[PDB]
Amino acid sequence: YSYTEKKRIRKDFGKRPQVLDVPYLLSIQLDSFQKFIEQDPEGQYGLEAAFRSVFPIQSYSGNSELQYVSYRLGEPVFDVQECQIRGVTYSAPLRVKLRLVIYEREAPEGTVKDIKEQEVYMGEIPLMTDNGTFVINGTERVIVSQLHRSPGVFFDSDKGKTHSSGKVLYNARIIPYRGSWLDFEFDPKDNLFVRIDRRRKLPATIILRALNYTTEQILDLFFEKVIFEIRDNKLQMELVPERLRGETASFDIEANGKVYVEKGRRITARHIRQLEKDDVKLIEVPVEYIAGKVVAKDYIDESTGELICAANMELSLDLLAKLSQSGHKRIETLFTNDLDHGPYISETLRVDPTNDRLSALVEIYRMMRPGEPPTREAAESLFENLFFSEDRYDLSAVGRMKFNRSLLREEIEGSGILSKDDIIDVMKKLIDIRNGKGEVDDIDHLGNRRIRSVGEMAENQFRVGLVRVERAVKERLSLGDLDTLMPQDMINAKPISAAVKEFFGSSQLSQFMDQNNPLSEITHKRRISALGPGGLTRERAGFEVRDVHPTHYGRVCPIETPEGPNIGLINSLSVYAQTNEYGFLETPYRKVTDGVVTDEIHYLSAIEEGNYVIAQANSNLDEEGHFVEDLVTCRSKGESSLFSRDQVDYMDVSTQQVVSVGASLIPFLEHDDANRALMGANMQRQAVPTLRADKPLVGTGMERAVAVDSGVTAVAKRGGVVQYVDASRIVIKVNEDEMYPGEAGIDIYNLTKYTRSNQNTCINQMPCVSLGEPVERGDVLADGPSTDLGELALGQNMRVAFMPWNGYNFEDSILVSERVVQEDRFTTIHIQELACVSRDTKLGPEEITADIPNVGEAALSKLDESGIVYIGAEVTGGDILVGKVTPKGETQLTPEEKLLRAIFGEKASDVKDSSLRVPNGVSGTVIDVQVFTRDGVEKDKRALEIEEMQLKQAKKDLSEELQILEAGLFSRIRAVLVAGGVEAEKLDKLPRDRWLELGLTDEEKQNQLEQLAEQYDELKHEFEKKLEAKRRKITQGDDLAPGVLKIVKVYLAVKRRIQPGDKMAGRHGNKGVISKINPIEDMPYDENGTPVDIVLNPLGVPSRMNIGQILETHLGMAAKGIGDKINAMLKQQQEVAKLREFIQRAYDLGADVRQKVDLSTFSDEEVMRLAENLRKGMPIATPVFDGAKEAEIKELLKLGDLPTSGQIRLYDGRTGEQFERPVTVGYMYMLKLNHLVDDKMHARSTGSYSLVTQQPLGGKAQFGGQRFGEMEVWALEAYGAAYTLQEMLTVKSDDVNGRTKMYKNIVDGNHQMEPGMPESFNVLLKEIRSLGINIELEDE
Amino acid sequence: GITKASLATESFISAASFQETTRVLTEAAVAGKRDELRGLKENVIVGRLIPAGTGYAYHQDRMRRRAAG
Amino acid sequence: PIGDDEDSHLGDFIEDTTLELPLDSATTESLRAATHDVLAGLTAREAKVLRMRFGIDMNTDYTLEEVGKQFDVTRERIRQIEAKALRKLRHPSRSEVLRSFLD
Amino acid sequence: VDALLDNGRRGRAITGSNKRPLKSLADMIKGKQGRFRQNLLGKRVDYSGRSVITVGPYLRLHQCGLPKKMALELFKPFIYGKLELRGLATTIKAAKKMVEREEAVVWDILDEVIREHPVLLNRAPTLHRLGIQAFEPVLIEGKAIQLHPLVCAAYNADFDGDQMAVHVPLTLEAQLEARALMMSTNNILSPANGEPIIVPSQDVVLGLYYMTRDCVNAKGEGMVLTGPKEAERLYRSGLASLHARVKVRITEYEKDANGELVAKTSLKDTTVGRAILWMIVPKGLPYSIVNQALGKKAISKMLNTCYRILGLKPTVIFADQIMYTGFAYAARSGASVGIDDMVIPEKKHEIISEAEAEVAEIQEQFQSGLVTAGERYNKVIDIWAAANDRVSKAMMDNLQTETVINRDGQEEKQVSFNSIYMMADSGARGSAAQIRQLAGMRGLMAKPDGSIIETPITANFREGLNVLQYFISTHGARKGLADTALKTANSGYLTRRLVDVA
Ligand SMILES: O=C(Nc1cc(/C(=N\c2ccccc2)NO)cc(C(F)(F)F)c1)Nc1c(Cl)cccc1Cl
């Protein structure tokens, strides 16, 4: 047990013990980038690897070589926080040592000179935070891991649809990690073909010739040999007795003076056995049997020296005669069978246009780059640079691995390029599949699916950067002089920097972390995608890949995946899942040796898991863990059924691992249909943090792990006692055992305070500990947004009643009491960052000055002398946050305006008001202001005030650091001095500064005192340098965009509670929109007089089948019961005994659960705190599929004083009369998604307009009007409304005249329209007429 | 078939909507085809009252005025 | 093309800043009524001198000497009539209609 | 020149410094998104808005709620002109300043310009003409749009966060077009078939169902009352139960004369609830129509007949009243759903075990070779299917008629008063298919290949599903959402081809 577990404990139902506990949920993200940037003294993936690949770069034959030595990542220019505030990128300089050697022309190889240029700078690269996040511009971002087709070879079917002959086809595909694709495919005529990439189809053998294989050797490779002998006269044949299988006798088969088979008798196993035992090597055959046989090799006349027959040519009765008289004894032919061993390659040669190697290379080079005249060196260079070049091609490790494995090879690791043996073996495998031996693989299987991650992809982009820098290096090394340039002038920065910046900045996989929520972050960081680079698209891949595969078990969550344009093209990583060594997906299991189920953990990949029979997470075993049933439900290969007691190799580790962390937070999930469950776990990520982090009243037990593993909370680095607790910071004094000898020290935690979150919500941390409290190592020292006492509260539980209330709950609609909006529980805090830009126009510079044309004293009131709003001033819509004015000269007025100015004597200002004003309707309080200034332009008054303030605050902070740290350090010297030197009262008298002189008796403690001295002075100077650096960071002008002189950022904190139109939902996939806010007066209540918070609609329950939401209600009620009872017994102030008794009774609950319990806990000061935290309700943990049962809940209801049915009598708060029938009341945990109505709501009358085509367009955040589409138009057409439609697409929108001419009539009180012609069609006329097309408008 | 019968429309402006625009414009432009409107889609594009519904009293009182005295 | 891969393309978002708002266009039409009624207030010759000294409902506008030659009375004379005219439209109930036009 | 006119028919030239091929005049004309020429894909429109939608049962069906601020910004020009027409504002400028300051005087002017001025409401998936309907604006404090429940069927709009858009009928002709055509009350019948689309939905039909129905015994059983008035008066006072068999005198009309209503009175054998509900039923409708159990179908045929007899207006007001009373009495009903409301057959485990014996029978036969593999497969699948049918028709009978209650004698049994049953039977929501999945075992699932697994789901939702069963259900779910989301698009394409051809 831990220390916050003494604060609060969650009652846990369920039986199955957890053999393995949930690992770090952020594992994958951190591991990836940990591999990317790192020093690996070998070819393993990392910057080192990608470096070694392209390097060393040598010039063209000129013997000027540039080789790579070693690299380093400098310390970040700005730390996480500073870089987040300022808005720059959190990164490190990449400093790489390069050695430029120049070989003395005319080797033996030695260098005239080699300049080692010290660490030339190329690019800065982003860094991953401890939370697995990146900051691109001042914003936390995540790179989603990718799922693609693993490299190597793959054999498919493509039966059915092609050709409709049903004959199917068989194709192989070699997909490298990088480089051109290699494809082989058959056709209806059984002619083997080959294509590089998706390009033109070529006869297979044409590649073989390019490997320098003459026809004879191709045949020798793909066919066996049938030997014909002309011994004496009239032939003979060599016969392997197995050759006659699957064939019928073509003639009398007789040898050894004994007739084995006659004519017309198919050769069976009998004939074959007879031939085998009698051992007949040579038989006599007719001269006519070779009429169809194909001659293996070439044959010439020894005398005439002329070619008798070419290789792979059909023999005739005459050709035999023509090669027989020439003195030929032996004739080799192809062994061909239309069933067993097929004659494919022969016919393939029959379709081959080429002859020799050069010819093949010609057709290939003319295939890849067609239309341009081929050249020998060109074809050679191409073909050698396709699959055989170390540069332009590679499968890497996973590729070579899967390649060799699928080829039934031995070697698990090999070269990164293809070999003749490789291509040949692949072709052989394809031919074997067409022959009937071997099977075809499927893509959907997770063994063929590889998982990438941040580091790998970043490595790829950096690789592209390195190749484009390589081209430049060679380009310059072409003409270069000797000892002038060095590895600086060549290598640039921007090419690489933008190469990585383009990846992190804009990519489909690189996105902004969704931080509205601790679950959202952690479930985003664990995610998979089949989209992006190196993957399919929604418009391409069909239903197969999207669909769930049995291999998804334990690897990928079946029920968590977005519902929309891409379904199952994303999914999520499962709970206990891990990335395999080679990059596949493997899940934990339990090895079952003999008859015992062992607790040893074993990880099996998608392919590893295949043959083994795995048992069930839900299975009955006892004592030693032997299976209770004689047969138990299991799954072995692709399928599940009942299995013998001991046939079982393995078993599931947990009742969880099938699902993900999102689904694992859904209580009573087993009681919910998969559709609504999916919707539930989908919306659970949308929950906006509440004002008061509450707690789930009905839990799972994952919510602790989610809260802790996600970076939202603050966890103790080391255990000890709290020296200091503030809403700002928390200082813990470290225990000695955990403490390091030097520096002594205490752990100081600076808590994040109110600040902007990516979703504009609020992120703020509060201390969960009090002054002088014991804290265990790895314990929550504070809670983040939407977290309570180390658990995850995504929302707030509350009283719910199921019953129709006056149709206000009508569809999914939710009827909530006033008690909720009054208690401000569902209230939310939004932090909006608003910006003001001071730019440069040709008319002049823009000023932030407080002097604003046309504003009242009340308008300039909330602004200081400089024109920026004070910190803390509450503002609403229309208030001026930052005064800004831009020059616009010579207004060029008109006559009546001129008379007006002449009468009123008003000077029309040369300046126009651009001031940043709070967006319409939104209202909040200003929590901060920042001023970014171009370096070298004078800081204004306000900015200076702020700068000085920040300087002082910094000095105070640093001074606090040094004080707490120094006192903490000397407090150790006091303790060590007392051992061997002890003077209690004598020591603390003299000044502390002079303590360092005092020694000690000979011992290691003297050297300890020495340590404390060294580290003390270290801290003392470190303070100095840190102060200096902080000051410089404050004063320096941040680099801004072109034209912008200065920028003012105001941070508004808006507080919106709840109003009709907001979206709310449970964890069960039941949505709703708050309909009306009903007084506590009209609320249905019970006999006790306690009203209900929320009234749902029962009708929503049966149709969409989620019954869990009802169970969640019931248990919830019962849970609250245990609270209320305790709430009374605390209000009765009984004693420790009664309380403890009741609590224990609650935590036991009938029989057979795994929870255990107390009275190892201090019976007074500890227990009474737990009971104090339990009075709000009794938190319960319902495991995913291991969760509670009806009987357990009813029992808990008995303990609660509440009915079994979970239904009580309810009275209308209006009439006061009872409602007929009982109604279900309880506590259902409910969230608030951020759909909030004051966001969604939009209205526009007359706004701005698009330039290119005049159409309504919002430029002000004042929204463009709704889009009237084709379907809406049809809807108008169906009715008889012509004028509604005309006014819709003419005057209200597209007519540059009609709109204004309309407006004047609308204000004049005349409703008409003078439509004219829409500008769209008017432009179409010009576009058409711009061509050679004359379009005109006839008649009148 | 429906998708086939949809291909044939007097008005070329209508054909330019849901069919392949590039071909339609040319194929009409060679024959010097004259689109008289008269249909819904075309009048929707050109931005005048629909020759149906309320507008039927318009297009009628027009259509007869056309090709007559 | 901007994000979403959709028909959203850069130029589609470039707003017309050269157009004038209708909310102002209704005022520009309304001021022409105001100055018209208010000019109906003064004497016919003060109205002529004021409509002339400014471009009100006429081509361009006219110099004070120009207004002189057109009135047969010339120089300082007109300059005086203007002031008193401006003076009559200065204090409220003449001004109350026009004074609402200056924001 | 070619690249200028139509690019891509030769070389596909690229724009300066950017890889993406430059857009030519042909692409300017053609547009994108298949074939969409702006008057097709869509066009932005002024004087409009949108937001999340809520219920508003208090509304008459000819109206709807609109947010104050929204109506202000929408009608802004009208508000200006009307502000200075009365003389509250000097000039248009000052009017803008007034509505910008939101002075107290503008709200009344807005109430003036809103009164007879209709507004158009629309949803996202517009299919049939009812996808857009006209309503009379009612100023409401809030940011949410209130939409009359009876119309929620026409839009196919749930309350789960669906948004609606609003357009203002600027010109006079548009106002009258909206009011005489696009108006809600003017379309009560689907254009596809003469059946009413204003048919009551869920809560209301549960209300009218609970109202007219009869339990065997209850307060005031077997008594007699003069008219529906004192029947209701009997009920509200708590003296008589809502459902009891009772004879009461009623006056029903028949218009069977020539253009003329005949009046007749009689003692009808009916229930208290039916008597109370009869007050609403207008004029020439016979009492018989309300003397039944009032299912969703019947409650629809009521409106239908009423429309084909009395005409439009009485049908409108009738429907409104039906909604109001439906909601009220459904509220009073106290209908709810507990975990015990779903009753599993007591004989379930037995059926499971027997059908489970059959599988080992055929299994033994395959072991001895009495049957082939595929034939065996068919056999086992048949027995499991039959089992599912058995448990289904078990829980159905149980959950349906099991209520056993006593009137003056020993025993008797009628159709159940159980909640979930009433819900499924009335047609409010739920159906035998889903109820079957709640109590009895649910089906057999089929792998993506379409090969149906011979080990069906033995458990249900009231019970727990284990790991396998849920995993096996997941595929069914994913294929469900995928297929439906696909058929939406297919429908769209079909409607497109259709409107194009007609
Ligand atoms: O997926 C297949 N079968 C298949 C079998 C089952 C099954 N039992 C299982 C239960 C749990 C996990 C895995 C299997 N049945 O008793 C379930 C599915 C499921 F997708 F719905 F979850 C598919 N077959 C298959 C194979 Cl083996 C390869 C490629 C494609 C398919 Cl469609």
Ligand SMILES: [Mg+2]
């Ligand atoms: Mg919906």
